[PDB]
Design a binder for this molecule. Structure first.
Ligand SMILES: [Zn+2]
Lengths: 77, 360, 93, 78, 105, 95, 79, 93, 90
DNA sequence: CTGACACGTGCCTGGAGACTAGGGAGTAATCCCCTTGGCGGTTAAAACGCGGGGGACAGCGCGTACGTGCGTTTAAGCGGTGCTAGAGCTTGCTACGACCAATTGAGCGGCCTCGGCACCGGGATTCTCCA
DNA sequence: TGGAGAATCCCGGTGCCGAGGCCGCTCAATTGGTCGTAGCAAGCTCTAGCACCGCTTAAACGCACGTACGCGCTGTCCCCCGCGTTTTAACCGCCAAGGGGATTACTCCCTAGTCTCCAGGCACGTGTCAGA
């Protein structure tokens, strides 16, 4: 019930920015799975980077490195 | 002569083996079928066509039988603890979808106690399940991992089924210099035999201290059966067109000699019927298919059999055929007194015309 | 001159698993390339870790982090358990 | 224009729930979730851009749960 | 005397050569004493992990040697190795024989 | 006379079970040298460089066809088409 | 020129290895423009390495390095 | 006295670039023209992106450059779109 | 440290009347760090391939040509070369 | 209308200016190997033709599931108060890694044998296909 | 199902050339020591991460509804598939030669290292107007 916080009006707001005009009724359960899968792979690395520094917070540059490792550079942090 | 007669008596023992097969094969052919669909870890366990296969190779009691249920495993890793190839303990390598046996572990080692307990539980459930075949499971003892299942019948019969992991990977590094059948069966036969799988039977050391129940010993009984059946360097020898070579017959009569000795006298309970087979397998590579494997001179066949046996007893050395650095009978495994007595017995029964074969 | 390859050690490691099995000298080129590729992946990642934390020393605790965030899934668990099994066996001697 | 499209508190709760599966007790900077969300939105915008074509290709206008698995099968993620 | 550093650690791969490679390559200003031992152990682990599966593929083919057709069926039939070497071409390895079930008649 | 398609499946199980190079080597060498002539003139190639280039270029095309088969099965057909290739190359970063 | 040396049977063999079951007629002229776009990229870099070593020959290592730079790693030719 | 940047006729710091090259674990030594060359390259790239973004803001009538303008400038130019692909930007939208 | 002072000087001539926000400058710094870490990390491998022990301007040049695409490279090289010709000349 | 950028001084910390030692990189000279070019013969593979049949494509119609709007409800967003974990820096010392000698077994190159394996030939089998 | 015609699988003999074993040797790993400074250990400041709470109200939720479009069905006709005959030019062996990669020996000049003098650049604070 915590993933469901990615409300349908939000998936539609993203799709309308991807250029979609007409959205099926089954892709919300699919976008949610895709989003969760993407977030697991970045949070796993963010935690792996924080533990190494023996820190407790998960800093922003830690997420930047975790993303960079995926091949998705991120500017502005 | 006496040898041909004892061979005919072994054929009579084959008749008794048929009498037992009548019930045991009927039991298993309908008992094994519930195992596959039971939806457990022992699902897919299939009996392996090894051992006697109705023959005399089993070397078990006249009213007793034995068979083995080969359960496959993912990526068995072998580690020999404080031993020399005689005892192995299993672990696992990386397996992407977790182990099917990830709940029989004892840390990293996979132990025979938990597996055999679950095995006996499932077997008792099945024997209580089917009513057409009159089957039971006698109580368990802590001295053997055999889950015996006594069979009711007009005359009592019993059987036991031994779990045996099956591994499809390479053979253990303790067998590299073993199975020397090159000049005898050819390097082709060997290199096409060391591709088969190998089995691990659960066996307790009963001499060590650290790990007792969590130890498995290699079993190559399938390769043993291979070499027994299609022996000879001639592809038709005992396969067609007559040509009866007497080398299995000599082994049979030697095994009968050892069994009669062990039944007659007590302390020979420390040397099983397997040592004779290892002696014969070390001897067949001593002289590949000489002219002296003919039905005549068979008394010479036994002179040489004994010669080799006594030579092994006297010098305190008989390597396991497949593991060549594992003395089956040695002081540490068996102190010298009993084997000295056995050498004396072999010497005596060599003379006086083998009195052990009068009462048979 | 003299070219140094891992062929000696890859052949040593192939005689432990699968005795009586050899390589075809082009598969050995495959395996030499694989070793020099994974070595570089681990070493570059560990080298980066040591630099994010303003350190100046690659230790056994950065090789471990690199093995954790480069190898996928179960490979990362078994690979570290043999890396630490060899850093104790090495100091007790 | 350029502003976020998911709601911040629900996404933060999602992030913390996913993270507690790795470290038992954890805490995040305020910018370590403004970056995780800000990158996760671009990932999905791009996935929808690439899955609109897999439906145009098939003579449709309605993206379906079957041509999101194609932009992912072809991109290596699946 | 003169024990090799790779024999104490129980390794087959060269701890000394690995340390020299770490030092001569531009990875860091310094390199500990447990880094070569850890990294040689990991490299030997991965090499044995690939080589055992490759050898099983060779042996079920009824062969006595490993060719690149066998280091392809070992990397591409394993969930984790396939993902570790997903952007890698094994020369003279071929492809994995898959055909969609909608093409069968 | 085998019905159409049967000899199309017959030789998928054949070229996937093998590892031979599927282009002719001398036409490929001529192509490689003709392309390189636009970068540097009077250039020589080790016989291993061309082997590498051909083995690297055939894997690309095999994978590209593996993607375009999906892009064709998606649109409810079996015959691949140039539009199919152009989609498979666009989902990827190639265009 | 030499691009036509990339025949139709060759591309059909590649397609059969890649799983394709039927092939439109315009595929071949479409594939010849794809391969020549691939090569022109792995060579432009394989020759940038070579001109850096001050060489006249294009070694296999130039090819494998230039392939790494595209994200495709080739095993069995050194490295 | 004269900074190396002034002599080279640049705006980016030649000294800091040299120091970052020396301390960065790139190679054992670092020539005297690598700092100047790399500073010139970096200055060229940044000057280009700013030339583009400043007149991409001028279209919208805003007299300041925000992540949106840099995003659009990257995504319009055919050259910087391929160099700076695979890249996300904060509030680039 | 940050390039936030040098980027501002470049802006002051490329667009003398335009300014840049804080977050745009933040990205500007990220961009310069990325470009540096790519060109230098390519020159490092160029030197290692040729068994050399020094990063020279002739390897920044090859890294530029290998990384920057098309008419960017052809310009970058030039604006690099000029600088070196200006530097070694003093 | 306010907080997000612009601009100003103290200073200290990192860069500029020498100087020297030595070792990496530039040059000239030889070696040999490995890339190119040619010759000539089977002959395997590309080219070409053509009949048809199985499939791309267009058309049509129903229906069910997607989009817009409206009344209601849930909870995100801003703020304000307040405390405690823990990020970030500092100061000791100490012990671990760099470096230099001198010794020495491991690993590379060269050499040489013969066993795995690629190929052939003729069953034997086992798909496909019209029916 | 029944069976004719074809591919594909397979198994007892060639024969060649590459995997692997061995030997001399050299150079790179090892042993033993010294030195110095990176990183641990401890202690402390105080930034910022969590926590609750109350009010406003933008946004999620739910329903109605009717129209756009997804999906099956049908037809038909382009255009690939399979097979056959014929052209061609790739593959192979073989030899020659010369261009170029590789190796070795001075040698010099270019980068690292060190000491020191200090101006560029960061931080803290104040003071506005672009524009959410
Ligand atoms: Zn016989």
């Amino acid at each position: 019930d915590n993933i469901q916080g990615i409300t349908k009006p939000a998936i539609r707001r993203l799709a309308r920015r991807g250029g979609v005009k007409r959205i099926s009724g089954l892709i919300y359960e699919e976008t949610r799975g895709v989003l969760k899968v993407f977030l697991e792979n970045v949070i796993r690395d963010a935690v792996t980077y924080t533990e190494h520094a023996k820190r407790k917070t998960v800093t922003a540059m830690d997420v930047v490195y975790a993303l960079k490792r995926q091949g998705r550079t991120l500017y502005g942090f | 002569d006496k040898l041909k007669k004892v061979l005919d008596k072994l054929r009579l023992k084959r008749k008794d083996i048929s009498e037992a097969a009548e019930t045991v094969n009927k039991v298993v052919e309908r008992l094994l079928r519930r195992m596959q669909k039971r939806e457990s870890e022992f699902k897919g366990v299939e009996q392996l066509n090894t051992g006697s296969y109705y023959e005399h190779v089993k070397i078990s009691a006249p009213n007793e039988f034995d068979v083995m249920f080969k359960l496959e495993v993912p990526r068995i890793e072998l580690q020999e603890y404080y031993e020399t190839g005689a005892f192995y303990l299993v672990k696992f390598k990386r397996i992407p979808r977790g182990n099917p046996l990830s709940h029989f572990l004892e840390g990293e080692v996979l132990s025979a106690t938990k597996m055999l307990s679950k095995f006996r539980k499932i077997i008792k459930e099945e024997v209580k399940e089917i009513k057409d075949i009159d089957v039971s499971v006698e109580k368990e003892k802590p001295g053997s991992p055999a889950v015996t299942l006594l069979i009711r019948n007009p005359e009592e019969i019993s059987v036991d089924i031994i779990l045996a992991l099956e591994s499809k990977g390479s053979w253990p590094i303790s067998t590299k210099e073993g199975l020397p059948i090159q000049g005898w069966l050819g390097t082709k036969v060997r290199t096409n035999l060391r591709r088969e799988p190998f089995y691990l039977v659960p066996k307790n050391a009963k001499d060590g201290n650290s790990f007792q129940g969590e130890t498995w010993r290699l079993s190559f009984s399938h390769t043993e059966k291979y070499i027994l059946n299609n022996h000879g360097i001639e592809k038709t020898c005992c396969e067609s067109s007559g040509a009866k070579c007497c080398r299995k017959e000599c082994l049979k009569l030697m095994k009968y000699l050892l069994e009669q000795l062990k039944k007659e006298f007590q302390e020979l309970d420390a040397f099983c019927s397997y040592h004779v087979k290892t002696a014969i397998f070390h001897m067949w590579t001593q002289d590949p298919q000489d002219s002296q494997w003919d039905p005549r001179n068979l008394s010479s066949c036994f002179d040489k059999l004994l010669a080799f046996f006594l030579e092994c007893l006297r010098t305190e050395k008989l390597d396991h055929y497949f593991i060549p650095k594992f003395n089956l009978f040695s002081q540490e495994l068996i102190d010298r007194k009993s084997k000295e007595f056995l050498s004396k017995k072999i010497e005596y029964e060599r003379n006086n015309g083998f009195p052990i074969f009068d009462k048979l | 001159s003299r070219k140094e390859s891992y062929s000696v050690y890859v052949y040593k490691v192939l005689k432990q698993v699968h005795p009586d099995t050899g390589i075809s000298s082009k598969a050995m080129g495959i395996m030499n390339s694989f070793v020099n590729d994974i070595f570089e992946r681990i070493a570059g990642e560990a080298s980066r870790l040591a630099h994010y934390n303003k350190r100046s020393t690659i230790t056994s605790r950065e090789i471990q982090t690199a093995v954790r965030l480069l190898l996928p899934g179960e490979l990362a668990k078994h690979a570290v358990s043999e890396g630490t099994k060899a850093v104790t066996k090495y100091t007790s001697s | 224009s350029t502003e976020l499209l998911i709601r911040k508190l629900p996404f933060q709760r999602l992030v913390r729930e996913i993270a507690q599966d790795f470290k038992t007790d954890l805490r995040f900077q305020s910018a370590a979730i403004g970056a995780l969300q800000e990158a996760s939105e671009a990932y999905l915008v791009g996935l929808f851009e690439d899955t609109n074509l897999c439906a145009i290709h098939a003579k449709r206008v309605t993206i379906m749960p079957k041509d999101i698995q194609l932009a992912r099968r072809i991109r290596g993620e699946r | 005397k003169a024990k090799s550093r790779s024999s104490r650690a129980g390794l087959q791969f060269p701890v000394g050569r690995v340390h020299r490679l770490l030092r001569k390559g531009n990875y860091a200003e310094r390199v500990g004493a447990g880094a070569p031992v850890y990294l040689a152990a990991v490299l030997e682990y991965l090499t044995a992990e690939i080589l055992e599966l490759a050898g099983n593929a060779a042996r079920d083919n009824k062969k006595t040697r490993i060719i690149p057709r066998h280091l392809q069926l070992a990397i591409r039939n394993d969930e984790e190795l396939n993902k570790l070497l997903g952007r890698v071409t094994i020369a003279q390895g071929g492809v994995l024989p898959n055909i969609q079930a909608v093409l069968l008649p």
